[PDB]
C-alpha cells in the first residue's frame, strides 16, 4: 500500500510548495492521478486476498471502498474551492491538508491487517473531520455538531478498544488473516453478551443505527460541502466495513444478539424515510435519507448471508456516490441563494435546465431505479431478508414507496412549479459545477455495466 500512501503524503508538500494561484490546480491534478493508479488494486483472486505485507492487505471488500475514497478527494477539492475563494492562502492550504490527511487515514484504515491498527486509524479520522466541521462550517450550530459527532463516536469506540485488547490476550493475535483460522465459537454467557456489544456498538453508532443517529443530522448539515461529501460517502462506511470484518469472530451469538438491532433498523428505516417527507431543510432531508439507506446495510450485515453481504457491499458504494452527488447538488443552490430551506427557491428547472437533469438523475439513483447499482444492492438485501423472514417484505416494500415519495418530492419542490419572483441572482451553472455532478453520476452508471467489481468478497 506504500504505492498509495507515499503519493498521498506528497500531496501535502505539493500543496504547500505550489504557487499561490495554483494550489487548486496542482492538488486536483495529482489527486486524480492517484485515483487512477488505485485501479491496480483490482487484482483480486477467487480464493485468496491480495496480501501485501505484515501491515496491509486488500480484498474485494476494501478495494472498492479504497477506489471510492481516492476518487472523492479531487471531487471535494472541486466542490470546496468556490466557497473558500476569499479565505487567506495559509488557511486554504490547511483546509486542503485536512482533506489529504483524512484520505491518508482512510486508505490505511481500509487495508489495515490488524484490528488494533484498524482501530487507531479508525479513530484517527475523527480529528481532521472535527476540524473541518468546526473551523470551516458556516453556522453557529457547527460547534454543537462537532461535539455530538465526537462524543457519540468515542462513547462507542472506547468499549471497542477494551474488547479488541481482550481478544488479543485470549486469541494471541488481532491479525485478520489469523483470526480467519483461529476463530472459536462464542459461548452464550453474560460476559460474551457485553463483548458482543463492545465489538459492535462503535460501528453501529457510525452507520448510524436508528436511535443512535442524532449526531448525523447535525454533523452532515453543519459541515462545509467537502465535509458532507466525505462524511456521507466514506465515513459512514467505516461502520459497515468494521461490522463486516468483526462479525467473523462473533458467531453464533449474532444469531440472537442481532434481533434488537434488526428491529431498530427495519422500523428505523421507515421512521427516517417518513421524516424526509416533512423536512424543511434540503441538506437535512438528504442527511436523513442516508440514515434510511444505511439501515439496510445494518440489517444485511446482521443476517450474515452471502446474498446480504453482496448487497451490503453494493449499497455502500452506490450510496456513497449518490449521497455525495445530492449534497453537491444542494450546495450549488445554496451558493446562489445562501439558504438551505427547500421551499425558498422553486422552479429552478426553468432557470437552470442542465442542472435540473443532474437533479433528476440523482433522484432516480436515490430511489433505486433498475438497473442502477443502487437497485442491485437494495434488491439483493431484500432477497436475503425475505429468506430470513418472509414478513420483512412488508417493511421493505413500504420503505421503497416512501423513498420514491421523498426523492421526487425534493425534485418537484425545488425544480418544478413557478420560480420565486424575488430571487433574481440565479446565474447560469458553472463548468465546474457541471463537471462536479457528472463525475459522480458517470462512474455510478458505468458500474452498472460491470457490477461484479463492487459486490465484495462473497461474489
Amino acid at each position: 500500500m506504500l504505492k498509495y500512501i507515499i503519493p498521498t503524503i506528497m500531496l501535502m508538500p505539493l500543496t504547500w510548495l505550489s504557487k499561490n494561484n495554483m494550489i487548486w490546480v496542482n492538488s486536483t491534478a495529482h489527486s486524480l492521478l492517484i485515483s487512477f493508479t488505485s485501479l491496480l488494486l483490482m487484482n483480486q483472486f477467487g480464493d485468496n486476498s491480495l496480501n501485501f505485507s505484515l501491515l496491509f492487505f486488500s480484498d474485494s471488500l476494501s478495494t472498492p471502498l479504497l477506489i471510492l475514497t481516492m476518487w472523492l478527494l479531487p471531487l471535494m477539492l472541486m466542490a470546496s474551492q468556490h466557497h473558500l475563494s476569499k479565505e487567506n492562502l495559509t488557511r486554504k492550504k490547511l483546509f486542503i491538508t485536512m482533506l489529504i490527511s483524512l484520505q491518508l487515514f482512510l486508505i490505511m484504515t481500509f487495508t489495515a491487517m490488524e484490528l488494533i491498527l484498524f482501530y487507531i486509524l479508525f479513530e484517527a479520522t475523527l480529528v481532521p473531520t472535527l476540524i473541518i466541521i468546526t473551523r470551516w462550517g458556516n453556522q453557529t450550530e457547527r460547534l454543537n455538531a462537532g461535539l455530538y459527532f465526537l462524543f457519540y463516536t468515542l462513547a462507542g469506540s472506547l468499549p471497542l478498544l477494551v474488547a479488541l485488547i481482550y481478544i488479543q490476550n485470549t486469541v494471541g493475535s488481532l491479525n485478520f488473516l489469523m483470526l480467519q483460522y483461529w476463530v472459536q465459537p462464542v459461548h452464550n454467557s453474560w460476559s460474551n453478551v457485553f463483548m458482543w456489544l463492545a465489538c459492535m456498538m462503535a460501528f453501529m453508532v457510525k452507520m448510524p443505527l436508528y436511535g443512535l443517529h442524532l449526531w448525523l443530522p447535525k454533523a452532515h448539515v453543519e459541515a462545509p460541502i467537502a465535509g458532507s461529501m466525505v462524511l456521507a460517502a466514506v465515513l459512514l462506511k467505516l461502520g459497515g466495513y468494521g461490522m463486516l470484518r468483526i462479525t467473523l469472530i462473533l458467531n453464533p451469538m449474532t444469531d440472537f444478539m442481532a434481533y434488537p438491532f434488526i428491529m431498530l433498523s427495519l422500523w428505523g428505516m421507515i421512521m427516517t424515510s417518513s421524516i424526509c417527507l416533512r423536512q424543511t431543510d434540503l441538506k437535512s432531508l438528504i442527511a436523513y435519507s442516508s440514515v434510511s439507506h444505511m439501515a439496510l446495510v445494518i440489517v444485511a450485515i446482521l443476517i450474515q448471508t452471502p446474498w446480504s453481504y453482496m448487497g451490503a457491499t453494493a449499497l455502500m458504494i452506490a450510496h456513497g456516490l449518490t449521497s455525495s452527488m445530492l449534497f453537491c447538488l444542494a450546495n450549488s443552490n445554496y451558493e446562489r441563494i445562501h439558504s438551505r430551506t427547500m421551499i425558498l427557491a422553486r422552479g429552478l428547472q426553468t432557470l437552470l435546465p442542465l442542472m435540473a437533469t443532474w437533479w433528476l438523475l440523482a433522484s432516480l439513483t436515490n430511489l433505486a431505479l433498475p438497473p442502477t447499482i443502487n437497485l442491485i444492492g437494495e434488491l439483493f438485501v431484500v432477497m436475503s431478508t425475505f429468506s430470513w423472514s418472509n414478513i420483512t417484505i412488508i417493511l421493505m416494500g413500504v420503505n421503497m414507496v416512501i423513498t420514491a415519495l421523498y426523492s421526487l418530492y425534493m425534485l418537484i419542490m425545488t425544480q418544478r412549479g413557478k420560480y420565486t419572483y424575488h430571487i433574481n441572482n440565479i446565474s447560469p451553472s458553472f463548468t465546474r459545477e457541471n463537471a462536479l455532478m457528472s463525475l459522480h453520476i458517470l462512474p455510478l452508471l458505468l458500474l452498472t455495466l460491470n457490477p461484479k467489481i463492487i459486490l465484495g468478497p462473497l461474489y
Binding site: 505484515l54 491487517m113 490488524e114 488494533i116 491498527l117 488479543q168 488481532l174
Partner: protein, 57 residues
C-alpha cells in the same frame, strides 16, 4: 616473681590452645533456601521484535 604487665599488654589479642571443638552451627541456622536458577546463554535478538500489537520491529 610477678611482673606487672606494661602499658598496652592486657589489650592484646592473644591465641589460646583448646580441645573444645569449633562449633559447627553456633546460630542453629536452618538450611538456606535454594537460589533461583541462573539465567545463562548468549543474548539473541527478540523474535520478530517487540511483538507489540501491529509493530513489525
Amino acid at each position: 616473681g610477678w611482673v606487672r604487665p606494661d602499658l598496652g599488654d592486657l589489650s592484646k589479642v592473644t591465641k589460646v590452645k583448646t580441645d573444645r571443638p569449633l562449633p559447627e552451627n553456633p546460630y542453629h541456622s536452618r538450611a538456606r533456601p535454594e537460589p533461583n536458577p541462573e539465567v545463562e546463554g548468549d543474548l539473541k535478538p527478540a523474535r520478530h521484535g517487540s511483538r507489540l500489537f501491529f509493530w513489525t520491529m
